[PDB]
Amino acid sequence: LVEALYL
Amino acid sequence: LVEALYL
Amino acid sequence: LVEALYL
Amino acid sequence: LVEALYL
């Protein structure tokens, strides 16, 4: 499981 | 499972 | 901005 | 900004 946010 | 957001 | 995962 | 994971 991966939850990833890139900004 | 992957939830990914790129901006 | 919200990134949310519920399981 | 919120990144949230619930399991």
Side-chain angles (χ1 to χ4, degrees):
Chain A
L1 187 163
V2 178
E3 184 187 39
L5 175 45
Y6 313 80
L7 66 160
Chain B
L1 187 163
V2 178
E3 184 187 39
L5 175 45
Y6 313 80
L7 66 160
Chain C
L1 187 163
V2 178
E3 184 187 39
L5 175 45
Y6 313 80
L7 66 160
Chain D
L1 187 163
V2 178
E3 184 187 39
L5 175 45
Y6 313 80
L7 66 160

